[PDB]
Scaffold this active site. Structure first.
Site, PDB file in Angstrom:
ATOM      1  N   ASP A  13      46.139  44.474  36.787  1.00 32.26           N
ATOM      2  CA  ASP A  13      45.723  43.925  35.510  1.00 32.26           C
ATOM      3  C   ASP A  13      46.252  44.661  34.284  1.00 32.26           C
ATOM      4  O   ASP A  13      45.687  44.538  33.195  1.00 32.26           O
ATOM      5  CB  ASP A  13      44.196  43.849  35.448  1.00 32.26           C
ATOM      6  N   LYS A  65      41.358  31.919  38.874  1.00 30.28           N
ATOM      7  CA  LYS A  65      40.001  31.376  38.885  1.00 30.28           C
ATOM      8  C   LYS A  65      39.954  29.951  38.350  1.00 30.28           C
ATOM      9  O   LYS A  65      39.181  29.625  37.444  1.00 30.28           O
ATOM     10  CB  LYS A  65      39.076  32.295  38.086  1.00 30.28           C
TER      11      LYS A  65
HETATM   12  O1  BMQ Z   1      33.864  38.551  41.377  1.00 35.13           O
HETATM   13  C1  BMQ Z   1      34.962  38.900  40.995  1.00 35.13           C
HETATM   14  C2  BMQ Z   1      36.209  38.175  41.123  1.00 35.13           C
HETATM   15  C3  BMQ Z   1      37.383  38.750  40.775  1.00 35.13           C
HETATM   16  O2  BMQ Z   1      38.490  38.196  41.008  1.00 35.13           O
HETATM   17  N1  BMQ Z   1      37.412  40.029  40.135  1.00 35.13           N
HETATM   18  C4  BMQ Z   1      38.719  40.596  39.704  1.00 35.13           C
HETATM   19  O3  BMQ Z   1      39.001  41.695  40.529  1.00 35.13           O
HETATM   20  C5  BMQ Z   1      39.609  42.767  39.789  1.00 35.13           C
HETATM   21  C6  BMQ Z   1      38.671  43.956  39.850  1.00 35.13           C
HETATM   22  O4  BMQ Z   1      39.319  45.051  39.223  1.00 35.13           O
HETATM   23  P1  BMQ Z   1      38.639  46.486  39.106  1.00 35.13           P
HETATM   24  O5  BMQ Z   1      38.931  47.242  40.501  1.00 35.13           O
HETATM   25  O6  BMQ Z   1      37.178  46.435  38.740  1.00 35.13           O
HETATM   26  O7  BMQ Z   1      39.425  47.180  38.047  1.00 35.13           O
HETATM   27  C7  BMQ Z   1      39.929  42.157  38.424  1.00 35.13           C
HETATM   28  O8  BMQ Z   1      41.265  41.591  38.365  1.00 35.13           O
HETATM   29  C8  BMQ Z   1      38.864  41.095  38.271  1.00 35.13           C
HETATM   30  O9  BMQ Z   1      39.190  40.087  37.297  1.00 35.13           O
HETATM   31  C9  BMQ Z   1      36.207  40.785  39.952  1.00 35.13           C
HETATM   32  O10 BMQ Z   1      36.223  41.918  39.492  1.00 35.13           O
HETATM   33  N2  BMQ Z   1      35.064  40.145  40.351  1.00 35.13           N
END
Ligand code: BMQ
Ligand code: BMQ
Lengths: 218, 217
Positions: A13, A65
């Site tokens: 991201d 999504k």
């Molecule tokens: O329930 C969900 C779905 C999802 O895709 N994501 C995605 O999963 C990733 C989580 O990243 P992080 O490890 O918290 O930095 C991000 O790209 C979010 O948008 C999430 O965090 N929760």
């Protein structure tokens, strides 16, 4: 089902092309499956998918999504697969017809759909959680084989695994930054997703290697 | 927001040439264009600036934002950097996800539109049952812009009741999905039209006709 190396999917991201490419390249020896979402795509364009394929031998999951009406969902999926995405993540809350629209394009284009059931953030408790079990059941009835569930709620992830069965593929975000544990998450998920814990680390490669070490027995 | 002729064009064509040609053909009838992922994922985010340079129109980024707070923030930033005047966000994911968007909009001088109930049949499965509460959440959060279904006038009316007359309400589903222009304007400030215009043999005449039908409004 896709063979996710080390059961770890990188949520790339970062919104800078140079940084996204650098970090992904540094953890390349530990991960062969990368999740690319709108933060990066809206910042650098759909061609970033192609760039990642060209530079790394990585599988790509477009985390868009998808949550529109059937007609628009169809167009979104077509454009995403045309760009080179191996799979796309679709929201289940908008209903069966919206999901079926995505499944139809994936079927005709030879790609995969991942159905997002419950989400990992606090807000998911307001509306999504209460509809999650039914959304999952709907997915099973529609023939969905790939699912996304929350690592932040082990009890919920467990129930989702029960509903979709052992044969379905389940990936789970929320590990690291959101509090989810790698080992516990793998009790139910085929692979877990990790973003910030890796891409914000001073040494992403060391962070990824450390996480993998914690689950070597799995 | 002052929407010319209370008509918002949903430009979902996926070809830059066709999108620009059609929008140009109906430019005299509108000043607000909704650009979504069909066009953005096909031609890039630079298409937003292109529209502003060519038409000077207002641009609503219909991205149905529906992620966790952290990601929602990034999505909104990238979107407003591209020149979008407003962005559409789903309410189903919860209050924190909506607030994340509201913060970025305030910081960049933009507006957030909260999508409460959708217009397609599938909306009846999970969305409709939570719609009123989602709208109340918008009110609690201070949201002033909403999106409701023209395909269900009674639901659109209920949404208007909840948010009040001061809130701004736009509604898709007119034309192709069966919604009526005039009936929709009984409750919505402006309605959205896509296919009925951009797929018509003569887009200009299509738009002209629709506007003619609501001349008294
Ligand atoms: O329930 C969900 C779905 C999802 O895709 N994501 C995605 O999963 C990733 C989580 O990243 P992080 O490890 O918290 O930095 C991000 O790209 C979010 O948008 C999430 O965090 N929760
Ligand atoms: O409930 C909703 C929300 C929405 O944004 N839309 C969008 O509004 C437009 C409707 O276009 P059309 O007039 O049916 O061709 C599309 O861009 C849809 O993605 C919808 O149709 N229903």
């Amino acid at each position: 089902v896709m063979d996710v190396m080390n059961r770890l999917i990188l949520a790339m991201d970062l919104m800078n092309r140079d940084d996204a490419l650098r970090v992904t390249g540094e953890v390349r020896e530990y991960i062969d499956t990368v999740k690319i979402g709108y933060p990066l795509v809206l910042s650098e364009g759909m061609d970033i998918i192609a760039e990642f394929r060209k530079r790394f031998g990585c599988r790509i999951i477009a985390d868009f999504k998808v949550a529109d009406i059937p007609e628009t969902n169809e167009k979104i999926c077509r454009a995403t697969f045309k760009a080179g995405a191996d799979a796309i993540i679709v929201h289940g809350f908008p209903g069966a017809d919206s999901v079926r629209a995505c499944l139809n394009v994936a079927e005709e284009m030879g790609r995969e759909v991942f159905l997002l059931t419950e989400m990992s953030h606090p807000g998911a408790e307001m509306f999504i959680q209460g509809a999650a079990d039914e959304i999952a059941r709907m997915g099973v009835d529609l023939g969905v084989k790939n699912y996304v569930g929350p690592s932040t709620r082990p009890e919920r992830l467990s129930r989702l695994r029960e509903i979709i069965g052992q044969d379905s593929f389940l990936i789970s975000p929320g590990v690291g930054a959101q509090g989810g544990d790698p080992g516990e998450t793998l009790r139910f998920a085929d692979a877990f997703i990790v973003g910030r814990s890796i891409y914000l680390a001073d040494n992403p490669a060391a962070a990824a290697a450390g996480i993998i070490e914690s689950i070597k027995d799995l």
